[PDB]
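Researcher: Quick one. two chains, 432 residues in total.
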Amino acid sequence: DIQMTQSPSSLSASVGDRVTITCRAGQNINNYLNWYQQKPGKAPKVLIYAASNLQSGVPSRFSGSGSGTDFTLTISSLQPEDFATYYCQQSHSTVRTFGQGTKVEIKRTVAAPSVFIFPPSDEQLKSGTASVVCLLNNFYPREAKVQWKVDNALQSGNSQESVTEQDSKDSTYSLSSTLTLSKADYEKHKVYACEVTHQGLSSPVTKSFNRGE
Amino acid sequence: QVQLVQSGAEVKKPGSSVKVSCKASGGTLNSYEITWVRQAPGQGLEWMGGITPIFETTYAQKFQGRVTITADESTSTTYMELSSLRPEDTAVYYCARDGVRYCGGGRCYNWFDPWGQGTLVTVSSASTKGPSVFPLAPGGTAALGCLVKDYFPEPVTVSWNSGALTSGVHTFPAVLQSSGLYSLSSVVTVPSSSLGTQTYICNVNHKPSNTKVDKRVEP
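Model:
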């Protein structure tokens, strides 16, 4: 019943910047208002209770204010470990309600990926499928181009990527690209290469192996 | 410090009901204000309902009676049942304690602490299937890993050496393959000088299929 409106839905800022997030309640909720922080893969954790009080253990760069309908959460000096989504929640009514959340992203300097390639295991080939894996480790920004070449033939439509969330310590990403073939097709070619383009690389980086060798 | 432990992930067919359990231990009280919250993939927290220490329930109207919270005081356990499941109900279901934690200014203030670890309920008619685990075999820094292929539903957890190896680990979000099954890799960067001396084992757990597999990854 009591609708909470949170804005912005996302923001990005550099380490040390001041970050402000807003929560608006549809009716007066006095100071019955909590803020939570949710990191990737984890349950949310309370940071602020009764609108303006820091949970014990929380760093003092966090604060909150507001009474009535308008509330703000402030980070005075954004830190890498503050990468998370923040939620407000009203406790005025027994029917609890949440704001929509604000995702906080961290801007940092460019970092080039370390590139690794893994041939399929002999165990997997017995099952009839070959997975070839290219790893881009610890880079920034997230945008990257990964191209598979088989015997210098640009591949299309037979690979899938996965990318991590920003690292809580160094704010980098890691990415995988998986080329999936039949054992049959895999054994018809020799050179397997993933080629990486990224802002932090002056020219594309290529990692490759030769089947069997 | 009370701790809340939930039942495991599972797939449920559309139209069926799911019952998720929340078991409390380690506190000083015999019953608690327990609330239930869910989070669909890429969505926010959505409050569902709660139960008081004397077992009065309150439900958000938006669920239209599909939610029932019950208690078994003998086991210190709270249950949330969500009925008439549809694919939009796929979500991590969380319990939490919502107790009074502070009073000031003439008022008392409730908040969610601690939380259960969450229970991923996948609404689908596809069958459970455990994963196959393959090694990603490795001067300077080396990379090695485990490829965890062809399982359903989410989730899979991966640790290295039981969780004793955490530095340099990246466990990638699962990808849905066109076969309808999930796949994922977990990798770790280690000093190359350690290869052939240090043992590296990935522990893969797919609770929905009761699959616990270890794979030693060697060069």
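Chain A touches chain B through 47 residues (CB under 8 Å).
Researcher: Thanks, that's what I needed.
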